[PDB]
């Protein structure tokens with residue numbers, strides 16, 4: 444298809460330059476993230492811990508250093524994206540979706556507990572859904588647990604982690620003076636919002652017990 448570009452953390456001069464490139468490439472340039480976005484450009488050589496970037500990772504977009512815009516504009520060409528792609532999380536996710544593999548939170552369920560202020564609740568719901576996870580409207584417990592109705596696993600869990608098959612998460616906003624006594628009860632973990640965000644930024648289902 445058509446390319447759809449967006450910038451995260453770009454200066455005004457950078458955003459103009461991105462629009463200039465979209466014209467050269469016959470592409471769209473947006474300011475709000477959408478599932479049609481193909482390319483997220485960052486200002487330097489590092490991922491931004493922003494919603495736009497995180498949505499771009501969960502979508503397996505190209506997350507590219509601003510040098511890509513400079514290079515394309517000097518050549519009037521869509522330069523080869525892999526040579527400008529941010530490594531680690533972005534790249535692993537891009538490859539994951541090219542191979543039509545499960546999204547990061549496939550087989551995972553999330554219940555958003557308590558008050559959210561510094562990780563907006565809307566943001567977390569966006570990210571859950573974008574990563575292929577399921578938002579729960581009632582606190583998870585065994586007598587209502589859908590994972591008994593069909594074998595449910597989390598593809599991105601490490602091989603030998605309980606998170607392969609214990610895939611349900613109570614998420615709380617960290618540092619409310621709350622560390623739990625047990626991080627896991629049955630199939631349900633209690634995890635801070637800061638863990639969830641770290642999983643996204645890394646494209647990993649990071650361990651809670653190990």
Ligand SMILES: [Cl-]
Pocket residue numbers: 592593594
């Ligand atoms: Cl079964």
